[PDB]
Amino acid sequence: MDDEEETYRLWKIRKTIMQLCHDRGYLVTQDELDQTLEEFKAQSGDKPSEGRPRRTDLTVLVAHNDDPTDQMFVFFPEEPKVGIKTIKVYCQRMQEENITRALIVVQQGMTPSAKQSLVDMAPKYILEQFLQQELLINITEHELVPEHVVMTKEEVTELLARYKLRENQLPRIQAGDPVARYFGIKRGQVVKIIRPSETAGRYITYRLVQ
Amino acid sequence: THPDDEDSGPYKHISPGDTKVVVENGELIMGILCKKSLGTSAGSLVHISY
Amino acid sequence: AKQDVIEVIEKAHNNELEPTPGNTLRQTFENQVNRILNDARDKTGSSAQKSLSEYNNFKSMVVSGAKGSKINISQVIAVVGQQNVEGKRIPFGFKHRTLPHFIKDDYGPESRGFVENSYLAGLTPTEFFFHAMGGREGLIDTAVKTAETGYIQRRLIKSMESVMVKYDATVRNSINQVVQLRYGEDGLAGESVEFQNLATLKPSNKAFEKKFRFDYTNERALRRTLQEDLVKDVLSNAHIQNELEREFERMREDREVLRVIFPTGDSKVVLPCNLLRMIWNAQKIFHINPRLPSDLHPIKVVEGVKELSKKLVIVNGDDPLSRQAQENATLLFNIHLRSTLCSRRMAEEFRLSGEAFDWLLGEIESKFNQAIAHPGEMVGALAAQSLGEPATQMTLNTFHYAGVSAKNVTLGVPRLKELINISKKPKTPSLTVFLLGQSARDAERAKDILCRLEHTTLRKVTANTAIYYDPNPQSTVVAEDQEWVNVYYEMPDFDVARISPWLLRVELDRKHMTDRKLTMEQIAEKINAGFGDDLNCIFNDDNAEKLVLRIRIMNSDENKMQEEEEVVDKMDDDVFLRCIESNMLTDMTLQGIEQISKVYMHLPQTDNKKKIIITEDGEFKALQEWILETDGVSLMRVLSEKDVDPVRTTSNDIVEIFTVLGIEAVRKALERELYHVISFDGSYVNYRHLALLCDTMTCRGHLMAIT
Amino acid sequence: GAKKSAIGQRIVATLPYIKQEVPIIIVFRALGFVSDRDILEHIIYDFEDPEMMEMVKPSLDEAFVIQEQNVALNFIGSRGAKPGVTKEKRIKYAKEVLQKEMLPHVGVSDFCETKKAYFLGYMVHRLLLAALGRRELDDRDHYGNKR
Amino acid sequence: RAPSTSDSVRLKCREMLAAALRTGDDYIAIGADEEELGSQIEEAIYQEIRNTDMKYKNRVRSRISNLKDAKNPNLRKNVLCGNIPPDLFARMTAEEMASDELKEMRKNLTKEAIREHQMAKTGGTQTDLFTCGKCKKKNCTYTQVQTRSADEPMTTFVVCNECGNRWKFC
Amino acid sequence: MEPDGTYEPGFVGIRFCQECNNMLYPKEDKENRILLYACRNCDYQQEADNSCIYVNKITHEVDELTQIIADVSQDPTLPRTEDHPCQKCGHKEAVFFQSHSARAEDAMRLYYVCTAPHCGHRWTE
Ligand SMILES: [Zn+2]
């Protein structure tokens, strides 16, 4: 019975990652953005032989921003709780494919040794980690949350020059902030927060990632 | 002020009704002054004077 | 009214009153008598104010608003009314009674604290003592509020004190970190602002077009020789037509952005100058007759407003980022200024001449330039006192809740203390779920989502439990179930020789079971999933007149051959069945899975300002609907449920908002919650102060409670 | 955990600054009434009602580990007194506390140990009535209960 | 013809569905074959479930339970006379049954009480006095707080919930 | 059985040992296929009279005509009623009252006690 929900969810999380890929600018197909639930059900031809490795097949590649510098890679592990062994094979898989970034969506949680190992992967390929439940809905669509746009290091240089500030003196944002995680930004990078204002109508802020 | 018929009295002939206060070029034309005209109000005579 | 209360008491004792939604029958009764006595006070209150002569000095003090009010007239002339304490009628102090002067259990008005008299006739002895009780709650409230607010204010000032606007006009604290890029997001002073109406929020797209557009086809109503003077000569100009047509093009785009900024549809904003009063000062002095013909060229107006727009410097610079900062920061004053000084608006309504308009431009320039906040100022300290002051004003625990539900969204100072501390465990956390369109106009869809959202434990659903000794179901002591046992002969027909002879039987309440829309296979599958296959369940049909569930426990069959000594230390299964019975109840979390206690109170909102939508005519409209209001916190999961709105679902709890929606969403939610608590008195604390408060607490990602 | 899944019956007693809580039936056994039928009678001498009697039933079951007054006195002593060696002074010390400090107003001698037991039982009964809801809670301010 | 079968469990489930159809001897007065119909029902259920799972077994029993109801022998009679086709009987999706004269009412009554649980939680703040100068409605609430006061005297606060508008008496 | 029945199986929470005067506990006899009750501190044992050993909730033992003693009829503070006819004795005048308990028996319904020494009868209306 709950299996039938799953399909809505598998549709639903795939769609959120697509918007996530689209906001980062990795150019997904408009049709994949437009993909309905009925089509997705049609796409995996629902109803047969349940618990089947649809998610291993759901694993997708996404192709490049303004400058085709390889790609970003998205992986949905079948295991409810993923351990280092699945990660190691997956690492063999990312290395063979020679991909540059890997997003893993775990269904319950990751072992701390794997997170450690993920922490060790940091020099080479980057690994990003989402809890399935927080990813299951597009948080960036929510009304409380203002439009965020990441700036290039050059734009940050011009910003600090024109206001005459130090990096240290800007407002900070958590590296684990759901929105910072959403873009996947690292330390030193700046996000431009654009807000509606009761009195300004529009107000622009910046937050240095801390 | 309490006066008149909120929401529909001023729309009924503007029979000046004298209630509503109007001041023009530094002269009080009509009406009666109260706490809403003179008090700590957002639009009191006193605020405008400052 | 007293006979009417006795009448309602007579209905109540008959047992047939029919309760009100979400309430016990006493509450229905108490809510009803309270409605009658209040209506009684107000009816005679409105009678006494009518009955007053013109010469009543008492009415003369009330009307100037000097001292005192309508309620006082009510109390001195009419009837004082129901007293109360802690928001309820005078409690039963003695056994079921307020005073020994009454009968036990006497819900009448007088016997439980209604004062029939006016101060002028004097109070009767019981009323006097129930009035002396109403006298204490206020004296005590006074002594407490003075101590608490003195403390809340000192802590607040102590945080913000070192914030201040610097000479490049960015607001920064002691270690020189930036708080805001411009003070209050526009760089204006708080004492020079005024309430103003935004013309462009005018309803109907057609109506806007008519009132604002400068026609060129010229309706046969005095060929431009009406109102305007020599402008009849520039009717043949192509350039002037295209430039104004360009003006109107900006106004449709501004009207579109302004609709995004203020989705609710309020036209009241704080802005400097008050352009409309100035036009009136301008008309009045130059002696402008609005019936006489005009003497003003439209292009002079349009370009003059452009030039004035450039003069209103708020951000000095020249590079692309300074121009964007200048443009966006005084966006809202700029769209307002174009809307007031519009060519068609200027020509028809305000009739100003050329000399009067040029003077008008010069004053707005001087007033706007004067309005910009003075760097050096102490802004951080200024704000703490403007926040501190309303905590001084009113309410500690008084109940004025009119949101047709639970007392929630605690009112007043204790709620302020929670936002101020960022309590990891508020006394009364909440959460407002709005519902998807279809499921919002229909009750039955709303009932199905509501049941999915609710969290109920099997203990609530169970009418009763029993544990029986029955080795042989085929001859069970419960002869009525006997029909079911024959029904379950083929129900694993072999391990009936192996399963324990101990029986648990559960009976479920019929109304409550139906209400959750549950089916037995859901329960069986839930309990099977929780305890395991070892827990062998069977159940009857959901349509039998006595809805019952039967539970046994199966073992591991093969290995249980008394190997060592049974690694259970020989626990009797009955005793174990109680532990199963205990935990089966306390654990089973069907539909709702976590902490929303009871989870709900469904509401119809038509009163508030919700679901405000745009229509194709262009105007705003009300959209009544069902919304779900919960008393618990689980926002992360509750957002992902179907037909729940992923957009407008909100919670008053700022720690949970932080977990899910990040630091910027905290900055907003906390503002709304601080705005909302101040707004209960509705003294209107100026927004710029709260923006500054929120920015200081959210300045560094992590939440910095001012503790 | 998997003991019985029910904490809301476990009636205990604090005696005056005894370093540890004691189960009430142990106190009764320390008074000397070892027969459960007698303890039950002392709590409620109107055993026509199965529900309250069932309510106390797990605390009687919990008491079962000991059924001698001497042992129960030594038990309260260890639950009271700092660690030591001999059992017998511990029984005597426990006995004088149980005699003198336990509701002194009902008596301070040996020869009225039985009467004291009756008063403890009406007290447990007074407690059980509120937990069933048969009797409203006392008011924290009722001047009738002030001096 | 009835679809071929060989499984012993399927055969006994048909026998029980047939036996349930034998209740009250209505099958005699109508003269309809309960063994062919029970087999057609069972086939249709199996076509849905495709195995002999607990869920199939539960469905067989609930089909049995519908046949054995003492208060509604007319449901059985409707299935016996072909007013209900086996493919329909096979699915409970078409509701559950409503010819026992009271339980349907009660479920309706339950549907009333949860709908009674929707009616207004508890309306209030109606006093109904002054007219609003915005949305032109008189549905308004008033607030009475701070008695005596320090220097902001117990002024009368009036709020229009209809559009969240608040003004003062005077 | 029938819908118009009742569930008072006689919850015998009391059946003490005939010898040591302590409580009996259930225990299985697999040999005889019968529940038995035994004292733990001794060998004494006897068969049960019911298959039940424990029940919980009834939820509605509305408990309307128990505990409340007839003698409450004497209390001067309770309202005497002119409303007539005890349903037992041909005499008017009854004291009445409500709930008087925490099982907040949302029970707003009134309980009436006859006051003349001929009944002591306690009904409800
Ligand atoms: Zn309104």
Ligand SMILES: [Zn+2]
């Ligand atoms: Zn014994």
Ligand SMILES: [Zn+2]
């Ligand atoms: Zn009688």
